[PDB]
């Protein structure tokens, strides 16, 4: 996994610049899948330039006549089993060729070695050939760059035409060739031996490895790719291909003429995401752009509203952004022109790329800075890219460009500033609107019979809308969802309940939010689209708007702007119509909406005003739905916006849908009104009208942000109409045929059941004589409200039950749960066996069966004490394993307590925030797990409140008391699954005993993900529901997030049965279980684990009271007080009995079923039939893909192996062999080694064993000590304990110092070193990653995210990069040199201080939570003084003790950062 | 610049200070101030930097401090440097460096030109006096030698 290039400066060819990246290329094999074969990769590619003498030679032996020009080679891929299809391929070639004129030479086929290659990689291996095509004509080089180009894609098309398959072509050019293929890394120059040549020479080189989720390869899927080689995977394509449709019907260019004709369905089909970016990227390139601007238009910088760049660069990233929809996600791309080459990042600067100028004129660039072997005697600048950086080669001049120097050269071609001032907002347009012409408010029984058509309870008012315009934010829940799902339920949910959200599993990050908040944009342009690949000043003329969201007001300002252009289209249908009403309403509008758009209409307004009790109202969702997407399919949608106004809009989750439908605006009126209405009566107090609309749209705004953050889009404009969304319970038909993109897996309710729905309350609110509101049950029980999965009489029994340890009881119980209509999934399943029933006593006993429950994670924070060591006790008891969670735990708590009862627990977790992670809690269990995704918040971090942190869990956390501790969304340490594999081997190293347990999330896609991982040696997955309990969390990620664990686990299952992957890992399910039944469903499904959860805090004494954010929790379970912790009730015992009944009760059913044991049972899906509620509800839920049984055929049907996944050994065995005498002895030792990029982890294993044998404080500082030379690999020193010193002499990678326990890390460069060592990067991303203790010295500049979620560190280094101290919590860091915009943001324990000689440090500092100032007192200078002096004692630096030398005159050089919650709490006062 | 790198011996600058000298260290002049004869001199405070990787120290001038002293009689004893032989010895071909001490070969201490021997402190520079001793011995026994060889055939 890894890109990489390397590029000649001064730009003459020669064999140089292919033999190194060979080089490059044979030493990336670490990152890659390794395969107990040896033979199967996943791709791999070089693209290198065309060595012209070769062929001239090839064509000279052949009997030609050399050319004057130079040539053209075409590499293609026709396929192997037949042989009228390469006949026909070449047929199709050769009179597409000649069709222009130019002379063929002859075919040529490749020399290959299949000895190296695997089976499953063999068996769609295609024929690989070139044919060489000569220009003849004399045209010029451009001119047969373009013709080639339209060639190259005839063909494409005509190859299609005859649905000819397996056919690829890999180049068609004069300037460049590509080798690529599905063969290991290191392997590639022995599939290729052209290669080897000596007349290969270039100027220029890309290579390109991959690492992919499944296991069936396909050749025309291995990078590079044509003009492009990209790392990272990208987020937004659903989105920006449905965009690239209505681009394409108004876009053309005199360069190509006619021909444009054949390139109008420029994204084919059967491409990745690479491949899109890379079609478009090519098209732009092609028809005038140089490849910066192109990268510039594609993916744009963070335009941010600071004094930071010149006014150019902002005018320049104005007009880029206006032009065209980014590409947002995880992108390190490395692309290249005919004359261009760039390497590039995206807009948060998530992947690593770094770089290295020789006094050569060679420049080396790529995702490790030790790929090719190179001396310090010859290097001149060491560097980094930061985000949306860019660094690029002119080889036709033969010059570099950095960053600035190119953006300022870019920055002059065009006069960008004299154009966006053609750019018109709407605040103007709003102050000069009048106050004047705002009509009557409307009637309270008016509006209570609009709101009772809808179903708006009161509920929906006092709980989700008064904090809103109260506060600013919005609503919290503290429980799980056990709510019926929407189809099965009977009341009216609305259409929008049908709609669950995405998120982002281990492939991409989720974008925190609430700190960088300044790359998240919510522009919104009217009259934007029109022709990309044109430049001039009407390109930037149009209505920009602040937010996609509009008040009353502003909507009337920008009607009175649009006026007599625009169209208002009706949205409402006759009550009595008839049977099929909606249908012909939805036929209606969108001929209208067509037949209006042609006639010159730029807008439309899609209103329900007109609704009556004789005319019931489309719900919008549907209406703006067919409405776009008739437009998109029938050219259109490229001339008009479209505006919706409706009157069921009151939370974040409707706007949210709406604008990922298509709609460009959305505006609510009904809420409005009913605020005002609100306000008039004297409910808020004495705060304006104003200043409350004000307060709801921040909150909206901020929702909006959170739910996009969530899926990782940064911008509004690439998620509008790209459909990030899916629907469950809807028809097949009625989804693919109104909606772009979604997948309904199980269909559900067609036209017939939401019109019957919409007039039933119609009616019941227009024909019936409503007073009031009913108070409705939605969020809390209510008789009058809708079912629930908890009510009273199931708890009482429960906990009856338990606490009298008697089976009937708990029989009857199961009986009540048992007999409810259906509420979840697993309900209208059935068991059905043909065997006989065999007796009770044959079974397997109740200790086998228990042993396969466990309980999920819990953190401390949430839970009291009592209750968490009551758990752990419990579970210990009888030999299952428990759960700690995040939080930490206890380490007096390590040892068992004097009744035997050990209060520890089997199982720890490693969070997103690493709050407690230390070398000591991960050596004192037997079983780990990784969280990647929680059941009730999915792609979101727990939150803790302010007055819930005591001393206690402040001291447990190493966090500041009464703070308010907020985990981040993303991990910062897995990026890719290349980073995942990092961080499991990292797990492994660090304890040599336990297991890896990865936890996911159920949505769709997750097959993929699930077969991902599993390559990564993870050896345990957990998929966890929608219905799963928390601790605190937004109402609307608990009730609109996730899905039912049903379609998940099958899915996982079905996917890791085809890849043969299934007999390596087990699978564990939880959220909702309850029943026997359920558990043996679950074990029918393919789980042979399980979770149980908030059952157990049923039956130590919660009731469900649903306020344990509140920190006032009458029983005391999920409470941080003294007064309410006093009233604990629970006792191990009653868990206990619940655990024996629950197994007793697996018993009997697998009695009664036929069976003796699980393993009879598991994967065995043909014993579950599916029976459906009715002939009176006709729901058209069909569970097949659901039931369906992939065979396995030789494997089990579960997990068949002994212990974990064992990995290879990194230099720490070499070592754990050398220092014998520390662990015999106990006596001081020096080792000496060779470090080198392909070992990771150095230093880890050896503090595993000096954990074990003293601990992590028993050995003196520098007791072991140890001197690499050499660039090191990743995660150098990770989980280090005091009494080892590592020294390096080099760089190091990534990821150096993560989770420091108390060790010591020094890092310099050589001592013959020419080099600046201030002005040069040696440690890359992500340094200090949560680490508790110890000392990092460094002599360079750092990466981005530098000491994030720092604890008690302590680090001095010389520079720094981006949001650098973010989220720090403790220790102090001392920076000499220039730092990134977003500093020390969310910073809340420590101290800092920056060395500022440019004197503009307020404008890259994050002032919001932390105060800068000088340094006034002594006790604090003797502190900085210090910390040099040890820097300059380690390092022998000469930056710093240049810095001691001038003491006096520098002191004043320095600022002090220090957090505003730790203003009381410090002991020496800042101040005088 | 500093007291440690003073060129010559340091008991001398003991006794100075014995004697009644007052040292003002790290300090350049830059104008002398009178009519027609000094009446005091400006000097600055310069800051030397820390050794290079090549053993040089920078200076660079303060550019807060500057100051004035009464002078009465002041004496520039900046150095020496060698005249211009080849000019005024009516010889032009004398081979020499750019600071002015002529190049001769290490074993004869022979000049460029044939019967002409030079050696002493105008070829190294501010040196001392036993410096000067031995590179007049050695000139002698190249000069012996020379002539004996000569003479000889
Ligand atoms: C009070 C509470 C605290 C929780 N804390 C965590 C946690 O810290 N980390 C985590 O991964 N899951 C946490 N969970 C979720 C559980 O791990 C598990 O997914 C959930 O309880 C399953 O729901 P169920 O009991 O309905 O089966 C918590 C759940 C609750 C109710
Ligand atoms: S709902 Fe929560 S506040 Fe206590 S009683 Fe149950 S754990």
Redesign the pocket.
């Known amino acids: 996994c890894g890109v990489g290039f390397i590029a000649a400066i001064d730009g003459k060819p020669r064999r140089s610049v292919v033999e190194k990246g060979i080089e490059a290329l044979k030493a990336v094999w670490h990152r890659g899948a390794v395969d107990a074969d040896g033979k199967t990769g996943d791709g791999a590619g070089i693209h290198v330039a065309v060595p012209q003498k070769f062929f001239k030679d090839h064509v000279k032996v052949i009997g030609h006549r050399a050319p004057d020009n130079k040539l053209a080679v075409g590499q293609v891929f026709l396929p192997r089993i037949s042989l009228d299809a390469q006949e026909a391929c070449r047929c199709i070639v050769e009179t597409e060729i000649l069709a222009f004129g130019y002379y063929i030479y002859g075919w040529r086929q490749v020399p290959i070695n299949v000895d190296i290659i695997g089976e499953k990689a063999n068996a769609t291996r295609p024929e690989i050939e070139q044919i060489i095509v000569g220009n003849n004509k004399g045209v010029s080089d451009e001119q047969f760059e373009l013709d080639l180009y339209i060639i190259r894609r005839r063909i494409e098309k005509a190859v299609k035409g005859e649905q000819i398959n397996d056919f690829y072509i890999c180049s068609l050019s004069a300037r460049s060739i590509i080798y690529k293929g599905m063969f290991l890394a290191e392997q590639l120059t022995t599939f290729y031996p052209d290669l080897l040549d000596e007349r290969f020479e270039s100027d220029f080189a890309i290579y390109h490895q991959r690492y992919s989720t499944n296991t069936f390869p396909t050749w025309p899927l291995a990078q590079p790719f044509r003009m492009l080689a990209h790392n990272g995977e990208i987020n937004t394509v659903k989105g920006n291909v449905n965009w690239m449709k209505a681009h394409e019907t108004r876009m053309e260019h005199p360069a190509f003429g006619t021909h444009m004709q054949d390139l109008k369905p420029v994204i084919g089909v059967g491409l990745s995401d690479s491949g899109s970016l890379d079609t478009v990227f090519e098209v732009m390139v092609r028809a005038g752009r140089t490849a910066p601007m192109v990268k510039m238009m594609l993916v744009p910088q963070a335009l941010t509203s600071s004094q930071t760049t010149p006014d150019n660069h902002k005018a320049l990233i104005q007009y880029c952004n206006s032009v065209m929809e980014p590409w947002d996600g995880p992108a390190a791309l490395a692309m290249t022109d005919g004359r261009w080459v760039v390497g590039g990042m995206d807009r948060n600067g998530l992947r690593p790329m770094r770089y290295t100028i020789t006094t050569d004129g060679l420049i080396i660039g790529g995702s490790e800075t030790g790929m090719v072997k190179i001396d310090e005697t010859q290097v001149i600048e060491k560097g980094r890219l930061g985000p949306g950086e860019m660094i690029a080669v002119d080889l036709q001049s033969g010059k570099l460009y950095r960053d600035r120097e190119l953006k300022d050269h870019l920055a002059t071609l065009k006069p960008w500033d004299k154009w966006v001032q053609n750019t018109t907002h709407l605040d103007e347009l709003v102050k000069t609107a009048s106050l004047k012409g705002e009509p009557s408010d409307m009637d309270k029984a008016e509006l209570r019979r609009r709101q009772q058509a809808f179903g708006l309870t009161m509920e929906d008012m006092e709980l989700i809308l008064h904090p809103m315009v109260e506060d600013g934010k919005e609503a919290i829940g503290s429980?799980?969802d056990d709510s019926p799902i929407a189809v099965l339920s009977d009341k009216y949910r609305g259409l929008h309940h049908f709609f669950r959200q995405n998120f982002s599993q281990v492939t991409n990050p989720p974008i925190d939010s609430l700190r960088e908040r300044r790359v998240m944009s919510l522009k919104t342009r009217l009259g934007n689209l029109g022709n990309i690949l044109d430049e001039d000043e009407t390109q930037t003329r149009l209505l920009q708007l602040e937010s996609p969201v509009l008040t009353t007001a502003e909507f009337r300002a920008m009607r009175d702007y649009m006026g007599d252009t625009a169209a208002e289209i009706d949205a409402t249908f006759p009550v009595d119509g008839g049977p099929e009403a909606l249908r012909d309403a939805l036929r209606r509008i969108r001929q209208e909406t067509e037949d209006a758009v042609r006639g010159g209409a730029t807008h439309v307004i899609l209103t329900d005003e007109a609704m009556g009790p004789a005319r019931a109202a489309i719900p919008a969702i549907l209406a703006t739905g067919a409405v776009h997407t008739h437009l998109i399919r029938s050219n259109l949608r490229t001339f008009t916006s479209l505006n919706v106004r409706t009157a069921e809009g009151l939370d974040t989750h409707y706007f949210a849908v709406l604008i990922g439908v298509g709609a460009t605006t959305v505006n609510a009126y009904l809420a409005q009104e009913a605020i005002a209405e609100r306000h008039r009566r004297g409910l808020f107090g004495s705060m304006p009208l104003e200043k409350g609309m004000a307060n709801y749209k921040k909150a909206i705004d901020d929702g909006l942000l959170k739910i996009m953050s969530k899926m990782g889009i940064s911008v509004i404009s690439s998620y509008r109409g790209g459909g990030n969304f899916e629907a469950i319970g809807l028809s097949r038909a009625l989804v693919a045929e109104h909606f772009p993109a979604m997948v309904s897996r199980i269909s559900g309710i067609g036209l017939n059941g939401i019109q019957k729905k919409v007039l039933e309350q119609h009616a019941t609110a227009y024909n019936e004589e409503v007073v009031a509101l009913p108070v409705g049950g939605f969020y809390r029980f209510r008789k009058s409200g809708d079912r629930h999965g908890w009510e009273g009489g199931v708890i009482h029994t429960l906990q009856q039950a338990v606490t009298n340890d008697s089976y009937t009881t708990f029989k009857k119980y199961s009986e009540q749960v048992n007999k409810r209509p259906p509420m979840q999934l697993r309900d209208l399943l059935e068991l059905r066996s043909t065997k006989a029933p065999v007796p009770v006593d044959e079974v397997e006993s109740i200790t086998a069966i228990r042993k396969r429950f466990i309980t999920?994670?819990?953190?401390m924070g949430?839970?009291s004490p009592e209750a968490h060591g009551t758990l752990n006790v419990a579970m210990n008891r009888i030999g299952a394993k428990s759960?700690s969670?995040?939080?930490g735990e206890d380490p007096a708590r390590f040892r068992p307590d004097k009744n035997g009862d050990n209060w520890n627990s089997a199982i720890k977790?490693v969070?997103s925030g690493r709050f407690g992670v230390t070398a000591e809690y991960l050596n004192q269990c037997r079983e780990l797990e990784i969280?990647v995704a929680?059941?009730?918040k999915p792609g979101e971090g727990?939150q803790l409140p302010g007055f819930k942190v005591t001393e206690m869990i402040a001291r447990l956390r190493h966090s500041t008391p009464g703070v308010m501790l907020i985990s981040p969304p993303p991990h910062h340490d897995i990026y890719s699954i290349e980073d995942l594999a990092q961080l499991i081997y990292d797990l492994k190293q660090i304890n040599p005993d336990a297991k890896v347990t990865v936890?996911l999330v159920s949505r769709s896609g997750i097959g993929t993900i699930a077969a991902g991982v599993a390559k990564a040696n993870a050896d345990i997955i957990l998929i966890?529901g929608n219905?799963?309990?928390?601790?605190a969390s937004p109402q609307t990620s608990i009730k609109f997030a996730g899905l039912p664990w049903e379609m998940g686990l099958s899915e996982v299952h079905q996917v890791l049965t085809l890849n043969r992957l299934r007999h390596r890992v087990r699978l564990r399910t939880?959220?909702?279980?309850k029943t026997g039944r359920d558990i043996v469903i679950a074990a029918m499904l393919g789980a042979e684990e399980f979770?149980?959860?908030?059952?157990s805090?049923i039956a130590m004494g919660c009731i469900m009271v649903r306020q344990?954010h509140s920190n006032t929790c009458p029983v005391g379970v999920?409470v941080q007080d003294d007064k309410l912790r006093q009233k604990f009730v629970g006792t191990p015992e009653k868990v206990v009995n619940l655990f024996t009944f629950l197994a007793e009760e697996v018993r009997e059913i697998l009695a009664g079923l036929g069976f003796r044991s699980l393993n009879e049972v598991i994967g065995r899906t043909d014993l579950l039939h599916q029976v459906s509620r009715g002939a009176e509800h006709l729901d058209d839920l069909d569970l097949n893909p659901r039931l369906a049984q992939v065979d396995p055929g030789e494997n089990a049907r579960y997990c068949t192996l002994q212990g974990r996944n064992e990995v290879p050994d990194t230099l720490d065995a070499r070592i754990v062999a050398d220092a014998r005498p520390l662990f015999e002895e106990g006596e001081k030792m020096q080792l000496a080694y060779n470090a080198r990029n392909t070992q990771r982890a150095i230093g880890t294993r050896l503090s595993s064993m000096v954990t074990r044998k003293f601990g992590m404080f028993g050995l003196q500082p520098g007791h072991i000590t140890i001197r690499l030379r050499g660039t090191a690999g990743q995660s150098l020193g990770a989980f280090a304990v005091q009494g080892i010193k590592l020294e390096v002499m080099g760089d190091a990678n990534d990821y150096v110092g993560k989770g420091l326990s108390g060790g010591t890390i020094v890092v310099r460069p050589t001592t013959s070193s020419p080099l600046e060592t201030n002005k040069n990067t040696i440690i890359g991303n992500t340094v200090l990653y949560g680490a508790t203790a110890g000392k990092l010295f460094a002599a360079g500049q750092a990466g981005e995210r530098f000491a994030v979620r720092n604890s008690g560190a302590t680090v001095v280094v010389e520079g720094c990069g981006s949001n650098g101290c973010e989220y720090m919590t403790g220790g102090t860091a001392v920076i000499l040199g220039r730092v990134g915009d977003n500093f020390a943001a969310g910073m809340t324990g420590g101290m800092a201080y920056v060395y500022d000689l440019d004197d503009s440090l307020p404008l890259y500092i994050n002032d919001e939570s932390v105060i800068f100032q000088r340094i006034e007192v002594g006790h604090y200078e003797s502190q900085l003084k210090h910390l040099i002096e040890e820097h300059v004692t380690e390092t022998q630096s000469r930056f710093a003790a240049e810095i001691l030398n001038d003491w006096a005159r520098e002191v004043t050089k320095f600022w002090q950062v220090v957090p505003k919650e730790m203003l009381n709490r410090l002991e020496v006062p800042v101040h005088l | 610049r500093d007291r440690k790198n003073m060129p010559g011996s340091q008991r001398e600058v003991a006794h100075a200070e014995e004697e009644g000298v007052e040292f003002i260290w790290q300090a350049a002049p830059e104008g002398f101030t009178g009519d027609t004869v000094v009446t005091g001199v400006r000097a600055v405070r310069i800051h030397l930097g820390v050794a290079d990787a090549t053993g040089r120290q920078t200076p660079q001038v303060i550019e807060g401090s500057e100051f004035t002293v009464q002078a009465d009689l002041v004496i520039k004893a900046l150095g020496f440097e060698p005249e211009d032989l080849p000019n005024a010895f009516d010889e032009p071909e004398l081979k020499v460096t750019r600071w002015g001490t002529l190049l001769v070969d290490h074993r004869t201490k022979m000049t460029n030109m044939d019967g002409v021997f030079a050696a002493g402190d105008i070829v190294r520079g501010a040196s001392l006096v036993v410096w000067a001793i031995r590179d007049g011995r050695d000139a002698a026994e190249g000069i012996h030698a020379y002539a004996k060889a000569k003479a000889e055939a």
């Open positions: 429980m799980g999920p994670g819990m953190s949430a839970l759960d969670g995040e939080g977790q969070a969280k929680q059941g009730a727990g936890k966890s219905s799963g309990g928390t601790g939880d959220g909702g279980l979770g149980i959860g908030t059952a805090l344990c999920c």
